[PDB]
Symmetry: C4
Subunit: 355 residues, 4 copies
């Protein structure tokens, strides 16, 4: 709604660090044939590999570029990524040689978004993941035992043996349920339904676990981000605490590096633009070079049209889309900010014509 996390066109690593798994797995099998992809996909295997050389050395001289110390072991993550597959180059042994090759699949783990999520993975607390856990025990040995008496119900040939109760259990516990045989005695059935609603329910429980994980995460990181953002702009220094709250919790947006049409003029949209730092380019009959501490988008506001203007960043700028409800509420909260509203309209008045 208020966020604009635009990213410059980038081929992500995922293609390069993933591709090895893809071609490997491709030639990874022997569909009764000599080789094609072996030669090919092994070729792209020395290509990818060489990519892992060049990346590594990128760490050699980039071991410190002046780089932050935030995640130290990410490095080790990488180095193992390149290494374990090294000795994965080092086997002359049986075709299981080929098998080990996939170890790279850790590669996407080089870096990713899993960092903060894990941030509340340990910060989750939520022992009810444990209690639910032991409950997984509960159901598991529940149907395990009932399945014991039942599989032992009719002994004569296949039943009456522990394996059946085991497997029927395992799948039944699931939401998946896929298989060759059932109770010929209803009881095994009815209990089966029991384990359905049960094991499924508990599945849900762990769900709500992860759910609260999501929310708590998004909250914490979001509003703290709004810490970094609040102190980050001067006008926020001239505005008192309650307003600090309102914005900290209100401001939701991201930065848009240069190279993209940021908006669409006379096209429907709901959002707001603020110059955190830098300039931003504006098509106007009297073009206007933007700077920090001002705000764009009263174009659409006072003009009456959604995105009555458009802009483009020549320099990377951090954007903040203001919530216009609390804005109107400040306009009407005190006379000073009603003066702000008038003068703002006036700044679009002069901006829309004069220089």
């Amino acid at each position: 709604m208020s966020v604009l996390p635009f990213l410059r066109i980038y081929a992500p690593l995922n293609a390069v660090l993933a591709a090895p798994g893809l071609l490997a797995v491709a030639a990874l099998t022997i569909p009764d044939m000599s080789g094609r992809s072996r030669l090919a996909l092994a070729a792209l295997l020395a290509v990818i590999w060489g990519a892992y050389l060049l990346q590594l050395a990128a760490t050699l001289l980039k071991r410190r570029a002046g780089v932050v110390r935030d995640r130290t072991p990410k490095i080790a993550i990488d180095v193992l990524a390149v290494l374990v597959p090294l000795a994965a180059f080092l086997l002359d042994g049986s075709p299981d040689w080929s098998l080990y090759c996939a170890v790279w699949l850790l590669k996407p783990l080089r870096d990713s978004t899993f960092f903060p999520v894990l941030g509340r993975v340990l910060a989750n607390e939520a022992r009810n993941l444990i209690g639910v856990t032991t409950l997984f025990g509960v159901v598991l040995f529940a149907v395990a035992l009932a399945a014991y008496v039942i599989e032992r119900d009719i002994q004569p040939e296949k039943f009456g043996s522990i394996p059946q109760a085991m497997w029927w259990a395992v799948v039944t516990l699931s939401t998946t349920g896929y298989g060759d045989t059932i109770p010929q005695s209803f009881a095994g059935r009815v209990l089966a339904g029991a384990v359905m609603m049960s094991g499924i329910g508990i599945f849900g429980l762990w769900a709500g676990i992860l759910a609260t994980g999501f929310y708590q995460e998004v909250r914490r990181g979001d509003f703290v981000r709004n810490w970094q953002l609040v102190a980050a702009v001067p006008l926020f220094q001239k505005l008192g605490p309650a307003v600090l709250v309102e914005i900290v919790r209100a401001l939701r947006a991201r930065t848009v590096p240069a190279g993209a049409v940021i908006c669409r003029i006379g096209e429907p949209g709901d959002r707001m633009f603020f110059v955190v730092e830098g300039s931003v380019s504006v098509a106007t009959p009297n073009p206007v070079e933007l700077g920090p501490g001002a705000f764009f988008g009263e174009m659409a506001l006072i003009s009456g049209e959604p995105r009555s203007a458009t802009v483009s960043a020549a320099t990377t700028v951090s954007l903040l889309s203001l919530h216009s409800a609390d804005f109107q509420m400040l306009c009407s909260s005190s006379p000073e900010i009603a003066e702000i509203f008038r003068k703002t309209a006036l700044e679009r008045r002069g901006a829309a014509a004069s220089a």
Copy 2:
């Protein structure tokens, strides 16, 4: 609770734009017979088609009726809808001719509610859909590999080949789980349970993704709608900012076009009526012609009965059902609005008898 999104009786497009898919698919097959629906459903095929002619021309002269520019390409959406199935008329080739015919199924995509939902689909941000994504990778090649060692466990005939590990993987990852064979070695089993709880869990993760999508959507659009609504009524101009908040966030309702009994007199209900614009018809021993800036439903309030009255819109009116808790809280917040409460009761007093 507070919303009354009543719609006049309308046959939606869905029957006309869907029907082609339905009859097509019907005769779409050849259950060993010459034709019945072919003749028939092809007849309704020229009927539907002609509907697509008449709609198209509706766009010709309706290309601009004075119509908004909001969604430009919706048009193109339609035109392709009618066109690709044109050349879908243009093949003389094999029965796969019949196959292409269904391309219309895009028709429901002409217009729908997907617009805003997509609005936060791009506005979602939520890279954790990406992180979860690569995680889908995680599990997938996890069970893919384990399934590799395991299917290669017993080589002699069917196992030890990549396809099995592949498919067992794919289904197992799911919540579906449907199939002909299992581990004869427990390990494949236990790992199987692992992939169950795992792949399922991640499924949940993407869930909470979409969930936050829902909420954020409903919020944004709702309260902004309450922007359009707040400034839309005069009394809101005589009421200060805090109250503006209370109502903007409180008001939830929709407009009811003419032609429906809006309420039920002396039937249990919780809601409130406000005349945004127009009149509304009221059965009274001294009938009263309603107008904007007044409010209906203190009938039920001060009278003591749920819906102690009923009304009907002769003209389309926008309705707003006030939350009576904060209402009482305004009645008791200041003396002025307690005067409002008394005089309101008095307006039902005069309204319930006099003219």
Copy 3:
């Protein structure tokens, strides 16, 4: 947490109105035998039936007992319940006679909690149930078509016919997935995974639909209930609006009819008791007869023990468990309510000894 919805021991209808379905279905089949339950379960069939006679007449003279008009058609619900199974007595025809018999299963629908839930079922709005709906279309004809090309992939015997694509579609769309055959061509597979994550996702979408349904429901009904409750007690008349808010939103509890030990003295618990109307019985060395407008549970509060006392209702009383955080916050909000806190402690002081 704060709610105590204790119900007197009652055999619910569910046993009587359900039992017919249970015995019926029991003898409902013919497991190769003459009859046992037929005679028996038909006996309990005239028993249940007679219960439906006596209930009906209960409506005859109870058509109006002075009873509310809230749900008129509930009656008709019942009468049909007894009637359709009448002509279900009226057939002499084939065994499908027995089949029709189950029509009672509507009986639990006589009355239930579905009323309010349906209250936001129509009050849901949430067209995204529609948009998602057409999306169900999306996926359905998606895999339907892909399955068309694929089942027609290998024509020679079973494939290349519409039925396969149909059914494989239907189950695959699910989370269930249960069946005899798969793609022998990967493509059908990969697309299969697609429909998995897709159809499943949409399932989730409809979920969040129902979820917001839950919440909105519980909220609306809850706090409105707190309307009925707020105006329902005199002290609430001596307390200003902000406090009205705090309690309306804070108070969560239910009424406990006479006949139950309401609390446990010196047993851990978190809750609070308030006499809405009537008395409540209290074991004390100087027993104290309770009355409205007072409050119980500063026993545990000021005493220092959870449930340092226990009580029992001789007369049905409505209970309200106060949130002690905002309570302390009133104690410390103004001096008057700190006097309330002292005098309250003093009322346990005199109550704990004197008469």
Copy 4:
């Protein structure tokens, strides 16, 4: 985010009270062999058992150690745990002897986190678990009946009998869906899809049931915990009610017993430390012995680095990580607390050098 529920390294009971189930089930079967684990796992069976002796006597002299009376029957829980498996020692009878042995599996139920969760299990109210329940009835006899007409569709051999409708029903109701046969008549199919989306949906309904359970739980227990915590610290006695609110709802953390590096100096982190009671050890060029009523972590705050310091508890201390947003909001709310902010910075100033 703000919570630090660190636990000293402990082998939980789960290994000892679980292990019996594990080895028992291991030798629990007879994979065609004389015995190995029997001798072994029965040996660890007398080991575990003896553990249950020693625990029991731990209750004998620990029947009261001065121990709380909170959960009385937990004891009985244990004693049965040891007893029923006693007579489970007492059978000389058939191999089902072995079967009974697993009764211990109740052991994890000795104590666990299920206590509060059950706390809102009874405190849930939420009759919609009942309404949904009867709905489970709804669907169940729905597909049960439709399956009746359908299985009786083609009578000649296997169909037309009640069992099929029964089982097809049961699984179909699920999300699992696993089986040998389908409708050869579409109708059974289409209805099948119906039961899919239906039974699944209701599954969701019960979900949202448990969900609200989660939330309500976490809330109640959390903020009440913040009751115990608020009154628990003196500074909270010098701070007025609104601030009491802010902290009660803000403070989220746990206690970290001695023996762990509590923080990481110059490593990225977001949290805060407060000395509830005791001291805490601090590496400083001028080491500082911590005491209650002070706060740690303005190191990171005013210093400019996340965790610009680290600490270790020599004595178990209760930790509270303050939310720095509302903190800044107090710093800027009144001059007194801005003096608090300055002097705090000064306490890191003196602490970072002087003694």
